[PDB]
Amino acid sequence: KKQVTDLRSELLDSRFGAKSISTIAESKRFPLHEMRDDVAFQIINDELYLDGNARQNLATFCQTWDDENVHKLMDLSINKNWIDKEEYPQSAAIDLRCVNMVADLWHAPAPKNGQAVGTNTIGSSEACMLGGMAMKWRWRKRMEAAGKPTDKPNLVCGPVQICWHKFARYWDVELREIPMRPGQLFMDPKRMIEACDENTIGVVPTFGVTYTGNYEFPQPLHDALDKFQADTGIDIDMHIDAASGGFLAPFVAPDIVWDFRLPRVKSISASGHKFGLAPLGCGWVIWRDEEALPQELVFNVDYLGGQIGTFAINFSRPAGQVIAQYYEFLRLGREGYTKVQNASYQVAAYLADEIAKLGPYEFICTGRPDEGIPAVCFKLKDGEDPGYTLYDLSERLRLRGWQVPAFTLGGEATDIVVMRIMCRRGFEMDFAELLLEDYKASLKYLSDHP
Amino acid sequence: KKQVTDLRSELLDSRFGAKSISTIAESKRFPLHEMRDDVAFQIINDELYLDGNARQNLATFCQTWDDENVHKLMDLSINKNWIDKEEYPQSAAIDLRCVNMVADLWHAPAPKNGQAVGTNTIGSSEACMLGGMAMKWRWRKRMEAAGKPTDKPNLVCGPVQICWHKFARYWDVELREIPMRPGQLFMDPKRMIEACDENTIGVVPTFGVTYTGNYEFPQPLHDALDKFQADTGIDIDMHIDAASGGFLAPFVAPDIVWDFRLPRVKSISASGHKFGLAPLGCGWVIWRDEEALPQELVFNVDYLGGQIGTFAINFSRPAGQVIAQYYEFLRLGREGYTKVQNASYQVAAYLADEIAKLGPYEFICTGRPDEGIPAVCFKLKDGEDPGYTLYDLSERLRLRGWQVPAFTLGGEATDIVVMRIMCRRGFEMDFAELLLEDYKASLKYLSDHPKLQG
Amino acid sequence: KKQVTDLRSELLDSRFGAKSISTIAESKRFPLHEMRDDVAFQIINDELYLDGNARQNLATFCQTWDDENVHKLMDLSINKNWIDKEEYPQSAAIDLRCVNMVADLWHAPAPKNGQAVGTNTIGSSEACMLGGMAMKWRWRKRMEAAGKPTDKPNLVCGPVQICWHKFARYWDVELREIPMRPGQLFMDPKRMIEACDENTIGVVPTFGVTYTGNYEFPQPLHDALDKFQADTGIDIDMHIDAASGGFLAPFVAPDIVWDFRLPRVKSISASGHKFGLAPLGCGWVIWRDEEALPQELVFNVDYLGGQIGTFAINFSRPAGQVIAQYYEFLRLGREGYTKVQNASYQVAAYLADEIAKLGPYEFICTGRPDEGIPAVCFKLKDGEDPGYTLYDLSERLRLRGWQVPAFTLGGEATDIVVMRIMCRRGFEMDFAELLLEDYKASLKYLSDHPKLQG
Amino acid sequence: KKQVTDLRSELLDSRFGAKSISTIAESKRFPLHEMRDDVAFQIINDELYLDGNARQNLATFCQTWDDENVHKLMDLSINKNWIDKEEYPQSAAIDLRCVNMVADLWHAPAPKNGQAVGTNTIGSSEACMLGGMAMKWRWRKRMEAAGKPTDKPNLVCGPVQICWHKFARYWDVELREIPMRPGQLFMDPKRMIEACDENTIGVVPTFGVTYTGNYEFPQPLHDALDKFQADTGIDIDMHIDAASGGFLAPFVAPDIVWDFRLPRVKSISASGHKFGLAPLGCGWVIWRDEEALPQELVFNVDYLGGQIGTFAINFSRPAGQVIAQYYEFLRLGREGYTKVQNASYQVAAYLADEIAKLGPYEFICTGRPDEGIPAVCFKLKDGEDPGYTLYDLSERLRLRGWQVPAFTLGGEATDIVVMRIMCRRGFEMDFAELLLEDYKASLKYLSDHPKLQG
Ligand SMILES: *Cc1c(COP(=O)(O)O)cnc(C)c1O
């Protein structure tokens, strides 16, 4: 009668008084028995509190807030498979409208057949990899036409995000990164050209450098590639990594010439889940036209009496993010995106101005729309010692729940330490004012505790 | 006044009487102005009905239902970034626990340092590419150890899913796919050996072929690779693509030796969102140990005072799916998964038995746990003409919302047409009985209208 | 022009693109204009994230989790007024049942008229003040029965919670607080008697000391008061402040004689929202009988053709907490409470055991049901220097969201520094294991960074 | 087999078919066993229907409705502790903002340090007690400076709410209440002065008398006190009990000089949960400056590197109401509050006009913003006999679920019976029209049944 005794408790026991919640969760072997669903949920729900608060995570570029309709659309699409174009046909059609809209946003040549060349991805990483493969294949064909070897490809770039290093390693391409150096934390024309040769598959300007928040302007680089071809005969194209900038500049700094308005840009990628306002799991890559995308890389699938071209690394995945993306496009439009991005820039500019009053800092980024993304990036003025480092300050801020990263730059600037604050949607003026309060309090604490 | 009058309507108009819903949604250019959020949601919500009913989609292998707690965990984790190990450390800790559990499920050698070698992925596609890259690299090392050229790698396999064709194309590897042929819809030992040579980076058995639903058993192939090494000195590894079988066999057919219990299996991949019961966006790949994974492919990141290795093609992505996976592991356990998979096999066998009574069919898969996944796959018996093709039957069933695919096999079986029914979680016996009723009705309709044949 | 376009934006603008959310919230004067309700809610909701996580708050004794039915009862009762007995008759009746239940739990003499003498309160503070007032009044009557002056009352006690200092100040009573001494962090019989005299209105044993988590046992003190009356003729009563212990001992240590089983105990108070499992806003005070509560302090009100006495400092307040309490009483009962409290002690004992293996500590409280509440309290062994102070450790833990207090004891132990961990409902074993991991990581960091010392 | 059979039933039985719901709820002793949570919730949920529909309760002054955002905010803050300023620092910050806003609303001298002197409370009762203690303490210091006894304090007031009778009893203060009398149901200057002497700790004018709904105007009384000091040298201050009026006059009758604009007003208290639109559990008390609040009554606590003074009777309690109060302040502003209050006054004025047409009534309050609160209070004209009493009418209305109190006034007006209708937020015009319809029906019934009179 022991079995019956324990079963009775298993039925009537409360959530925290239950035997199944009296032990530490399994972390080594596959669990043997099934257990009360409420206890299983409670345990995991509580463990997740150790992740901290996403709204206070100021180190990330990804969306940490979504409105009610996106929550509903995501829940409604939880089981809609993005890859099954024939089984989820309307989801696929929506995806295609987004491709057209993004292509239009980036000034891609108007599609004669009514459909821009491009695709949704899980994020910029996959988007950049697809962009890199196409870049590699176009180069191979160029060299084959020239009768030259194709076994030593290289890629020229500036302070790229880690996905490009992974591309380099996984696709055996030599990465020629122009290192940052004091006063020049990016790839300038001169050093770019110095790294280019006939084995260069392309150049990748980062329209919104992660480490600094500033844009690498493609035009001056584009001018240098034109000169290079006129001098050497070598014709190099560009892929713009606009993970962040792709959904900012079009709305707040439309005159910046960085997209398909530039002849050598054959493809551009961006993260919908960054400033594109979509929930985690949405990326985009667009090609200027069909000739920029080698067909050998596209796998066609049947779609409504015909066949659509697919180019992806992943296969099955949720279609909720693209649906959410389309919702934002329709609900906000250019007008809405401008208002939302302007709100971010206002907050970045505010913090930039206020923080400048509190210490001997030299800013790298101050939330200016014509210079980069809505972020504040600074370092202590060389030789200035206020009695603390940005690492200590970063730590004091974390005591209040904020994640504000302090880190060293790369290349020839490794001796420089910077602090970066990202101002995304959902980091409203009032909320950022609280951060300013904790910053002042942290400084005051560091001054009284040397 | 016109302006204020229009604004008054914009504020007071009902959902369907509003001016903003009187037009066709944009599909060509980025929208110019903002609009009422309720109208935007409504328009899209309604368009999505044209996707049909996923619960009636019997063509997919992916989860079409999730319990309430998973819905809650997914909603709570909508903004948790899987890649940010330092910013979302407990999500990272949970993911690592799942790696251990899946590695354990597949009999991987127990990790001496407490952490198995492997990673979560968006799905089996990424998992397979990671496994494939590791294979190419290990092969290169093997060849370079003997001073031989590595310019012509090839991969030997059977009727694989399209992701392996993509792998071959993207990574410049020659795919040597042994084709299907009547009576042998898989990669048999004899033909496998024929295709293998010094340039083979590895063999990929499909533990659960999509086309037929049957398992390609790794053991007999393993025995062949042993003899192959004895005769030629060529040592070939295996990567098991257990996209479906990975979360089935361990529960309902433990006696099948297909995993790390086999020495040549250096890695295994499977889809959590298929029979792993996780929501779309979850896959797994495990390596038997440190030596099976080239560190040159791993990018280390800072994590709680130390470092964690990362091998992934994607970067930022939601952590909800892996959190949901862990919940299923904890809530169900071996006992629970066994009961859920048992229910699927019950239905598959029911339908296989019932449908057999309705026509001149030859079954390729009958939902037997010892032969493959919970699926029903059959063709019309050679030479018989019931007055209809499976294509016609498929179309009739679609009139009632069901998506039951009818298709021709590949290789040397391109003239054979099969119909496949997938029995996933959420396709309970009662629901399946309704399908059977529609099947019977479709058959009576086809018999009354002999012209539909063709 | 401007007014119209502005209103359009006000109507169509999204949450964060709205002009109204472009500024800092008002904090000095009453706002002049009305604003979008979604923006007002959003701003406040977001500000509240700076409060941190209540579940990781290990400093509080109050409930930080409530089940769904309680969330529902509270929402349904948001506007039910506890004081209006005639207007909310059944809420009143339920409250009265709770009084009988708590009185029963504490062994109060069975009430002849079917209703125990006592009342619900906002918390132990008001309850203690009511008990203190009755105490002062009974003392006055005793003194007046012999024609003696009542201008110099004093109250004898040990390491009491701040509410007794407030009672002493507000009601002009001299608080004779026996200070903590190393090895004697409580009011012992000998010192209690030294402080007692004819002007003592009562003795207040703290059955669950906040600073240490240990029980001050009323039995030994009661024996001392018996001897004291025998020796001096002075008869002194007790009021037990069982804010925490009143909802612990009855379930996990029934043999401790601390309640109305002791003749001199004329009243007992406790916090429902502490270990009574009620949501914030519920306290209790019970008197052993009619004679223990001076009628002059009670205000009778009409109630269903009759009258019931009321004794409270507050007037209008929500009835939800007492309704929630009754639900917990009925849903859990003695069996359920015993299981929830056992879970807390299990966790406290766990942490006590594991933390001991991490440093030169001397424990004051180790989560033993026979010595006190479910808490872990410790200090560094005298003379030992592990390279850090508990203050530094507390600070490191806060980096992970945990609020674990480190503070000096009072009295003659102001030189001692302790760290106290509260183990409440909702601080399950798995969650506590995460804290332990953070403790281990903090210690390693502190060992790698000596400068942090002090 | 019996134990297992009944267990199966406990699992499968429906809500009302379960054995656990087959008995009467416990009401005498602490429950022994734990029971199904759904049955426990159901039983209590159902018992609560016996309370009156709060929306139809026209006797209460407290909020009987709150918007959706307040419900959400309250649910989110169910466990935030108002007292732990250091553990819930932002909740504390928001509270202080409210203190500033309320002080500003009442014209308190602008705080030089940026923070007004005052505090949030559970309701007006605690606020008034805090206000009273401060008056008592200031008086004592005045007397001690004069070298006069402080053992016979008294307080002068008009028809105050019961909380002042409690203050008087609990703090041993002699209450000198000026009684109501025909013609003047309040404290007039002449009779106030006649009760004042050197032992008077202060005067408490009620800015919104509960019994009548009319305001007691502080100005003429303040004038009398100035003259009294000039004639006797006795300096007496005031504390305004603006429980209701505090959140009315500022918005709809700005010109009434009743607040800090008056020199003798050293403190004011009001109920946030009455016309302040906050949910039950919120009150306020503001002091004109630091000098008006004796420091010996404040207990300072650590707050963000500094210290914040606290003065409260309760300790732990929910922070949800203050957060909700701040939300209302921000969402409505002076514009929003004026609209909501104007709404109540329009409804009260409507009922007053309509009810006057139905019988021989003499109105004491007709919902005029310059005279008092949004209420209707009347009596039968002296001598007139319509064939019923207001008690009978009150009873007929209760048959329709309405709670409309009928009661006798106090003092020298005990022979006067009045009926009072409270028009709160949420008692919209349409709703009140239904009441008017029932009032007419009750009258027609009382006329058709003459023997009901009495
Ligand atoms: C964040 C980022 C990426 C990676 O994009 P995901 O969306 O995280 O995959 C790539 N490039 C740049 C410049 C980035 O900022």
Ligand SMILES: *Cc1c(COP(=O)(O)O)cnc(C)c1O
């Ligand atoms: C479905 C499937 C895949 C692809 O897996 P995803 O989760 O869709 O990426 C790969 N291999 C096999 C055998 C499959 O069935």
Ligand SMILES: *Cc1c(COP(=O)(O)O)cnc(C)c1O
């Ligand atoms: C917490 C506590 C109090 C105060 O009770 P509240 O519920 O916070 O008003 C009083 N006494 C003791 C011993 C306590 O622990």
Ligand SMILES: *Cc1c(COP(=O)(O)O)cnc(C)c1O
């Ligand atoms: C209602 C009222 C009180 C009591 O205030 P609570 O908020 O109910 O505690 C005190 N004075 C007056 C004049 C009142 O109307």
